[PDB]
Design a protein around this ligand. Structure first.
Ligand SMILES: *[C@@H]1O[C@H](CO)[C@@H](O[C@@H]2O[C@H](CO)[C@@H](O[C@@H]3O[C@H](CO[C@H]4O[C@H](CO[C@H]5O[C@H](CO)[C@@H](O)[C@H](O)[C@@H]5O)[C@@H](O)[C@H](O[C@H]5O[C@H](CO)[C@@H](O)[C@H](O)[C@@H]5O)[C@@H]4O)[C@@H](O)[C@H](O[C@H]4O[C@H](CO)[C@@H](O)[C@H](O)[C@@H]4O[C@H]4O[C@H](CO)[C@@H](O)[C@H](O)[C@@H]4O)[C@@H]3O)[C@H](O)[C@H]2NC(C)=O)[C@H](O)[C@H]1NC(C)=O
Ligand SMILES: *[C@@H]1O[C@H](CO)[C@@H](O[C@@H]2O[C@H](CO)[C@@H](O[C@@H]3O[C@H](CO)[C@@H](O)[C@H](O)[C@@H]3O)[C@H](O)[C@H]2NC(C)=O)[C@H](O)[C@H]1NC(C)=O
Ligand SMILES: *[C@@H]1O[C@H](CO)[C@@H](O[C@@H]2O[C@H](CO)[C@@H](O)[C@H](O)[C@H]2NC(C)=O)[C@H](O)[C@H]1NC(C)=O
Ligand SMILES: *[C@@H]1O[C@H](CO)[C@@H](O)[C@H](O)[C@H]1NC(C)=O
Ligand SMILES: *[C@@H]1O[C@H](CO)[C@@H](O)[C@H](O)[C@H]1NC(C)=O
Ligand SMILES: *[C@@H]1O[C@H](CO)[C@@H](O)[C@H](O)[C@H]1NC(C)=O
Ligand SMILES: *[C@@H]1O[C@H](CO)[C@@H](O)[C@H](O)[C@H]1NC(C)=O
Lengths: 48, 48, 133, 130, 108, 107
């Protein structure tokens, strides 16, 4: 049984350093596709 | 055959479809006798 | 400060429209949630229903929808209608207020919290007896 | 040896089609074919050159669509490790033709990392009218 | 996007000679990502060659072909009555892949 | 309905029959016969105005404890029954109040 509260597990990440890491990897990836190309992060496709 | 209904009913939280309560028979060390057992299984573990 | 006065018919014939009205004086009814509690002799308290700013008359499911809750903002009153009543609920009524405070145990983003209704200011309450005689 | 797909279904404009391409026909089989081999789905119209329609990976059935058929094409497999599906919602009277499913290692195998569709299977037909 | 064209669209030959199936690429193929298929009406389209020049399992000695850069050739040694069918070449690389239009041999 | 008999001077601990399961948020009541009910303790720690500082509840730290009401300095007129309203997570929206613990002080 569950002796307590029915809760859901959840993973926490810090927003500021994750946004800085995304900006850094975008600035790194921008060395291969010129300057004025809009890089868009999206969700997954699907499957299992 | 798992007779399985919803555990923790009428909960207004997010976790509603998961945590289902099912009962089933299981064999013991004496093969003529059985044992009724109760357990909780997730939504991704049971198929109707 | 919110003050509550009561009014009652007293003598009620069975199986018709019952109406017991409490009046509010002192403030408006914009945020406080009005509820009604029935106290019968021989048992404990009983929750009839409550109303909110959503104008939702959520009744108790153990009453078989025999009560009707309504409010009004133009005359500072509220109507408590009944139909097809029994002679076995001779009880004193109560008109109370209730504030809603949230209780959070996990994260608010998923909805792992709930609501309660605290009743701090109550009314005097007038008894209503129903009988065939 | 050879792949198996069935179906000679007719359709109406505004519906969806379901094409299943299995390998080794008996249903209780453990071919393991959809396990380390990519699978290509290819459409061909009569009187037209064949065009690419979509590949599915054998790792966890992660699909790779094209930009022409992106928002109206979902395809995956079931709990058993056979019988990949093909759901094409948002029909049209332009894609009337034959459909093919081909096995392809796609440069993931151990010998030589080749690029070839070694076997194609069946080839169904989809028509639509009113 | 690399468009794959084929200029010998219509071909006719007798059984027992060598035929040339040429294909032109748009801009600089990698010379290792190309395939040839033998299509027919209401049959099983099988493969005949790997990459630039490498035979498959069910392929005899008479099927070969090479090419590099932007030109790719298929060189059949002899013509059989079981080979009078259309051919389709395709490339690989970035999705979506594109076939090479279409060519066809005939008996005359 | 459960009776209780506590003499003068010493304190008393009153529990309700509803076994709490989860995060608790109780509202302890007190109803004199004929008068109006009043709110004593809400949200397990707080107390409204006008109520004396003699009623202490139980916090929600170290879940597994009993939600009781402590009456320090019991006087002679404490004959009104109490009500232990239960609001938790698993049982959902509770409608009824519960058993009325009738405290009868002697002397
Ligand atoms: C990933 O991240 C997410 C967030 O992004 C994390 O979720 C967070 O999870 C924790 C618990 O795991 C939640 O804490 C809970 O909060 C509720 C209510 O929130 C209170 O805190 C707010 C913060 O403000 C200060 O106050 C607290 C003390 O209350 C300080 O300790 C803090 O440091 C802050 O400085 C506050 O804004 C709230 O608002 C209310 O404030 C006052 C007080 O009531 C009112 O006047 C206001 O009007 C308004 O209503 C509120 O104060 C708490 O209730 C929870 O504590 C209770 O439950 C515990 C477990 O049962 C128990 O141990 C506690 O003792 C407590 O029980 C009793 O204690 C109080 C003591 O005074 C009593 O008064 C009270 O009645 C109660 O009965 C709990 O602490 C976060 O809210 C949640 N975050 C969000 C955004 O929802 C997640 O955990 C992360 N995951 C991982 C893996 O890292
Ligand atoms: C990775 O893929 C790219 C893209 O296909 C490959 O680049 C291509 O390389 C060929 C040479 O092998 C280039 O062809 C050349 O074209 C010029 C004219 O542009 C011509 O003058 C030369 O004689 C030659 O034919 C081709 O243009 C080039 N494509 C692109 C888009 O740059 C590359 O070879 C692949 N492999 C790696 C990087 O290992
Ligand atoms: C084995 O059992 C699973 C679980 O039911 C089957 O998967 C479902 O199959 C039905 C077929 O009508 C689909 O409608 C469901 O969507 C499937 N559930 C999924 C994918 O989660 C599976 O088909 C069974 N295998 C057999 C009978 O060979
Ligand atoms: C995660 O855990 C570490 C453990 O030390 C802690 O320092 C940190 O504050 C926690 N939270 C986040 C958002 O990283
Ligand atoms: C992320 O970092 C960039 C730094 O260039 C900043 O401009 C931006 O406001 C940050 N936040 C988001 C949500 O992008
Ligand atoms: C993109 O911008 C950076 C700015 O530092 C520059 O160095 C780089 O040359 C630019 N890319 C191109 C293709 O000009
Ligand atoms: C276990 O077996 C008995 C034997 O008749 C049956 O009545 C019972 O329903 C079984 N248990 C379950 C959970 O089906």
């Amino acid at each position: 049984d569950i002796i307590g509260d029915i809760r859901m597990a959840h993973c926490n990440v810090s927003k500021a350093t994750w946004n800085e890491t995304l900006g850094k990897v975008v600035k790194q990836l921008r060395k291969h596709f010129g300057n004025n190309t809009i890089i868009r992060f999206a969700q997954s496709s699907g499957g299992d | 055959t798992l007779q399985c209904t919803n555990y923790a009913p009428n909960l207004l939280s997010n976790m509603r479809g998961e945590l289902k309560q099912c009962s089933f028979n299981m064999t013991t060390e004496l093969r003529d006798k059985k044992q009724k057992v109760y357990s909780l299984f997730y939504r991704l573990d049971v198929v109707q | 400060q919110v003050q509550l006065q009561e009014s009652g018919p007293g003598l009620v014939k069975p199986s018709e429209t019952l109406s017991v009205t409490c009046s509010v004086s002192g403030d408006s009814m914009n945020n406080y949630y009005w509820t009604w509690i029935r106290q019968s002799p021989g048992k404990g308290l009983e929750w009839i229903g409550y109303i909110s700013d959503r104008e939702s008359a959520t009744y108790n499911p153990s009453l078989n929808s025999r009560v009707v809750i309504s409010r009004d903002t133009s005359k500072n009153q509220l109507s408590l209608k009944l139909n097809s009543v029994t002679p076995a609920d001779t009880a004193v009524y109560y008109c109370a207020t209730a504030r809603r405070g949230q209780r959070i145990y996990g994260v608010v983003s998923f909805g792992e919290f709930f609501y309660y209704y605290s009743m701090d200011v109550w009314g005097k309450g007038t008894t209503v007896t129903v009988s065939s005689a | 040896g050879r792949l198996f797909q069935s179906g000679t279904e007719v359709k109406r404009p505004g519906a969806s089609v379901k094409i299943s391409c299995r390998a080794d026909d008996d249903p209780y089989t453990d071919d393991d074919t959809f396990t380390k081999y990519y699978t290509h789905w290819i459409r061909q119209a009569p009187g037209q050159p064949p065009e690419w329609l979509g590949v599915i990976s054998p790792h966890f059935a992660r699909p790779i669509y094209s930009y022409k058929f992106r928002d109206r094409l979902t395809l995956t497999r079931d709990s058993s490790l056979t019988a990949v599906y093909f759901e094409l919602r948002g029909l049209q009277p332009d894609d009337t033709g034959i459909y093919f499913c081909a096995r392809d290692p796609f440069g993931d195998m151990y010998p030589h990392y080749n690029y070839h569709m070694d076997v194609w299977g069946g080839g169904t037909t989809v028509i639509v009218s009113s | 996007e690399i468009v794959l064209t084929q200029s010998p669209a219509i071909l006719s030959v007798s059984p027992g000679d060598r035929v040339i199936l040429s294909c032109k690429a748009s801009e600089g193929l990698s010379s290792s990502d190309l395939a040839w298929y033998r299509f027919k009406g209401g049959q099983i389209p099988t493969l005949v060659i790997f990459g630039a020049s490498n035979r498959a399992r069910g392929t005899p000695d008479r099927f070969s072909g090479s090419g590099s850069g932007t030109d790719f050739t298929l060189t059949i040694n002899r013509v059989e009555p079981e080979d009078f069918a259309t051919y389709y070449c395709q490339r690989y690389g970035g999705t979506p892949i594109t076939f090479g239009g279409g060519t066809k041999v005939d008996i005359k | 309905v459960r009776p209780l008999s506590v003499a003068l001077g010493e304190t008393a601990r009153i529990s309700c029959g509803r076994q709490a399961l989860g995060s608790r948020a109780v509202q302890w009541y007190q109803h004199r016969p004929g008068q109006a009910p009043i709110l004593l303790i809400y949200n397990n720690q707080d107390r409204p105005s006008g109520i004396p500082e003699r009623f202490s509840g139980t916090p929600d730290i170290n879940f597994g404890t009993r939600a009781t009401l402590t009456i320090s300095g019991v006087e002679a007129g404490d004959e009104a029954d109490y009500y232990c309203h239960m609001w938790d997570s698993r049982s959902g929206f509770s409608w009824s109040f519960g058993g009325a613990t009738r405290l009868t002080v002697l002397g």
